[PDB]
């Protein structure tokens, strides 16, 4: 029925709306909401609709093989699970990897961040902000003028170029076979962009689709292939030789990588960040500041990208936890502490001995229990309306010291901003990006477009669907900049005479302690990722993953506290409750990865 939690007044008496499948995500999700007399969402229900059981499958296998299994949790955030796995095994066995392996892993991680973020925004998210049919009405000359205002440095800006792109779209649509645009919500009043902005965005959608395949060639060089590049416990397999054409890594290969990094930097600076700033400005002007959810109070990240390896104080995206919207106090987060990260299954399709408690992942349990509540409409194999008072999702409910947290690029940027305000110098660049962005959104872009200047603070702008989308773009840019530096450090280290790529001292399990436990954490594209392993007599005894979309998409916990997705949808008006435009726009701002969330 109705109850209050975390400042939200949940009420399920209104009209029930079902969105199944939620499309333009990775994997499978069902979303249900209730709307009031004025089409405002007053209840939201997040249902993960898939499970594979990787945690169960890993039992008894060799820890050195684990990375390849868990990599297949997700082909979108491809490699982040492999990284978490090798880190967890290295932690369990006290293995320190050499400098070149560290830098190569960081470059692969930051390449994934950029590819994942840019593809998400253009190919999954943009159609929630952009009306492709409106782009057909655009004047190519005014689109060229907009492009030159939005991003002066982007060379692809002529009226003729935009006309050609428009004409291809026109012919595609006029064929009667609309493909990915079929049955879309085009013409909804939820869309506010002018035709020229729509054409600009669709043009960049097509540019990004062609360019994204180039960026991943960095993974291919270091890891053999993309998706699913290879990793290694103890280092990297891509051995180095300069003097050499039959080594995985030589100077020509490194020069190739640098050429790709430079292309990435240009795309982020000239295409991606400016588009998000421009679209964000126009939706801000429309007053669409919904979707803040838990970002306004509680955010978490483990912290990542130490500029000195194994020295967490040097994290370039410094982490921790913020509670109650107090940005003056960042709490330290310890993934080894049994009282911090815990998972509940009270409203999930699993079972524990006692479901009134949350388990730390070293003590985690994954036993499936697909059962539906008494208030379900439909049957076990034909659900009409899911019963959120009972078990309603394949996603577990992770909490931090019992608190529900939002994770992701937005969480990392709020944390970075908080750290920077307390004197942390490693967070200077994200702070600079945020201040630059607020000035662009409030003053510069409005002035260029003849719109009124606004005075929103970062504390006001960031906790919103617009802010969540912005943070992703800024993070992409920051990651591109960081791996540019990593490349220089890698080459410098190799030229100084250190060619080491793997520590094999503890490769053989005859060298291992007879039991051990370890944890590996990663700032994955969607937020805080952790793998927790227990090893016994050379084998995996327990392996538990808590993944970013597990946090964000989580169902309610034992106390009935809602997770980030459900909180973000609350109190959002819908133009038409039968067209899920606003639901998709906000859910997509989290970049939901459902295969990840359930594993």
């Amino acid at each position: 029925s109705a109850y209050a939690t975390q400042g939200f007044n949940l009420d399920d008496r209104g009209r029930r709306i079902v969105v199944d499948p939620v499309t333009r995500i990775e994997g499978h999700m069902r979303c249900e909401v209730n709307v009031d007399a004025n089409n405002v969402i007053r209840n939201a229900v997040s249902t993960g609709t898939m499970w594979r059981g990787l945690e169960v499958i890993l039992k008894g296998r060799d820890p050195r093989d684990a990375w390849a299994f868990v990599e297949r949790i997700c082909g979108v955030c491809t490699g982040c699970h492999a990284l978490a796995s090798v880190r967890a095994v290295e932690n369990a066995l006290d293995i320190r990897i050499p400098k070149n392996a560290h830098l190569i892993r960081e470059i692969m991680a930051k390449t994934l961040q950029v590819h994942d973020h840019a593809v998400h925004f253009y190919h999954l998210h943009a159609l929630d902000w952009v009306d492709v049919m409106s782009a057909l009405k655009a004047d190519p000359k005014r689109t060229s003028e907009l492009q030159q205002l939005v991003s002066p440095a982007h060379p692809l800006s002529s009226a003729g170029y935009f006309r050609d792109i428009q004409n291809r779209l026109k012919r595609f649509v006029e064929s009667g076979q609309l493909g990915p645009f079929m049955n879309g919500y085009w013409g909804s009043k939820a869309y506010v962009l002018p035709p020229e902005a729509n054409l600009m965005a669709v043009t960049h959608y097509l540019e990004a689709l062609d360019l994204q395949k180039e960026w991943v060639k960095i993974h291919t060089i270091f890891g053999g292939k993309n998706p699913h590049p290879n990793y290694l416990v103890g280092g990297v397999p891509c051995a180095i030789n300069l003097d050499a054409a039959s080594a995985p890594v030589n100077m020509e290969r490194l020069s190739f990588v640098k050429a790709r990094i430079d292309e990435i930097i240009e795309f982020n600076k000239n295409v991606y960040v400016p588009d998000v700033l421009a679209i964000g400005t126009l939706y801000k002007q429309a007053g669409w500041l919904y979707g803040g959810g838990l970002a306004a109070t509680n955010v978490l990240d483990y912290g990542e990208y130490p500029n000195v390896a194994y020295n967490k104080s040097t994290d370039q995206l410094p982490g921790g936890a913020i509670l109650n919207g107090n940005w003056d106090e960042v709490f330290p987060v310890d993934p080894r502490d049994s009282q911090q990260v815990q998972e509940f299954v009270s409203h999930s399709w699993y079972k524990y001995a006692d479901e009134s408690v949350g388990l730390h992942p070293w003590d985690g349990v994954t036993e499936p229990n697909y059962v539906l509540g008494a208030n379900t409409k439909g049957t076990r194999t034909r659900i009409e309306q899911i019963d959120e008072s009972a078990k309603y999702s394949w996603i577990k409910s992770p909490r931090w010291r019992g608190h529900a947290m939002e994770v992701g690029p937005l969480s990392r940027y709020i944390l970075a901003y908080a750290h920077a305000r307390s004197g942390n110098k490693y967070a200077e660049r994200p702070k600079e990006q945020l201040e630059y962005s607020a000035q662009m959104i409030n003053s510069a872009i409005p002035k260029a477009l003849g719109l009124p200047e606004t005075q929103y603070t970062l504390k006001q702008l960031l906790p919103s669907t617009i802010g969540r989308t912005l943070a992703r773009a800024l993070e992409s840019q920051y990651c591109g900049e960081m791996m540019h530096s990593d490349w220089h450090d890698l080459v410098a280290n190799i030229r100084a005479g250190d060619t080491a790529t793997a520590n094999v001292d503890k490769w053989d399990p005859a060298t291992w302690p007879l039991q051990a436990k370890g944890v590996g954490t990663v700032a994955a594209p969607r937020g805080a990722l952790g793998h927790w392993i227990r090893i016994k007599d050379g084998r995996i005894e327990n392996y538990q993953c808590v993944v970013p979309t597990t946090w964000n998409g989580s169902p309610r916990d034992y106390k009935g506290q809602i997770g980030a997705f459900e909180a973000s949808l609350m109190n959002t008006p819908m133009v038409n409750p039968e067209q899920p435009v606003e639901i998709l726009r906000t859910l997509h701002s989290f970049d939901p990865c459902l295969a990840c969330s359930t594993h």
Binding site: G179, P180, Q212
Partner: protein, 270 residues
């Protein structure tokens, strides 16, 4: 008219959809806009919920027996099929519905083809490959985790140009892409033939690109185009970047022992 493709997703990691968009020849953009009509695909489609599901019925009616069903991932038989739920119903019911009127069925990747990672022991969801569920339709398997991008678009291109499934081997794989073992043309073969092997990671042999057989390379028993076509516009492949093949295009590769355990009987592969 461009041939409709209804691209379904079961239990999956989405690696096959991702690999598909890496294609350089042809570009995925050109495939979507000019070659096929990608009418259903949960990863890219504008419509959601009821609007998305309504597309299936429309296309199946208007193009009966003249659309391609592409399947990424697979259906689970445990949990009453509800370890993969679409539109409140088991995925298997969607798969069977769309398969009935398809001209051809493509099983993308190792999941759809053979079971994939979720089917590795003890297979908690009883994940089952497409050809064990759909037993009365022509199916082409395009295995690999994921398959090479140009192999995926190569299969589509052939099917669209000729309105035919290409010649298949006994396991249902296209001979034009899966006739060779990795080991047949692997550029490290001269080292294998001379008994020159990597024995520990980053040893002197590894820096010289010696054969990876003794580090567990499953290239000698794995059929794919990786050693010739290679990955991401011919940039590299697992072995060129220094890791042995783990056998990812082969049936049950997840349960063939540790990836780092060498194959026995080395003289078989000489």
């Amino acid at each position: 008219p461009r041939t409709p493709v209804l691209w379904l997703h079961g239990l999956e990691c989405t690696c096959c959809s991702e690999s598909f968009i890496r294609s350089a020849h042809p570009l995925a953009k050109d495939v979507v806009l000019s070659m096929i009509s990608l009418d259903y695909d949960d990863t890219l489609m504008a419509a959601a919920g009821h609007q998305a599901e309504a597309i299936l019925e429309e296309i199946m009616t208007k193009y009966k027996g003249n659309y391609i069903l592409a399947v990424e991932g697979n259906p689970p038989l445990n949990q009453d099929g509800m370890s993969c739920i679409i539109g409140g119903r088991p995925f298997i019911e969607q798969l069977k519905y769309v398969a009935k009127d398809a001209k051809a069925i493509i099983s993308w990747g190792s999941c759809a083809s053979w079971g994939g990672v979720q089917a590795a022991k003890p297979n908690p969801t009883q994940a089952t490959p497409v050809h064990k569920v759909i037993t009365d339709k022509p199916i082409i398997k395009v295995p690999g985790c994921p398959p090479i991008a140009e192999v995926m678009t190569g299969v589509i291109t052939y099917m669209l140009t000729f309105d035919r499934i290409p010649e298949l081997d006994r396991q249902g794989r296209p001979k034009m892409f899966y006739s060779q073992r990795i080991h047949d043309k692997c550029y490290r073969r001269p080292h294998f033939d001379a008994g020159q092997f990597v024995e520990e990671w980053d040893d002197e042999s590894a820096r010289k690109g010696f054969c990876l057989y003794k580090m567990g390379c499953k290239g000698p028993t794995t059929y794919n185009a990786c050693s010739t076509t290679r990955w991401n516009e011919g940039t590299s492949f697992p072995i060129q970047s220094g890791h042995g093949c783990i056998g990812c295009s082969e049936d049950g590769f997840w349960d063939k022992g540790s990836f780092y355990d060498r194959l026995t009987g080395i003289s078989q592969f000489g």
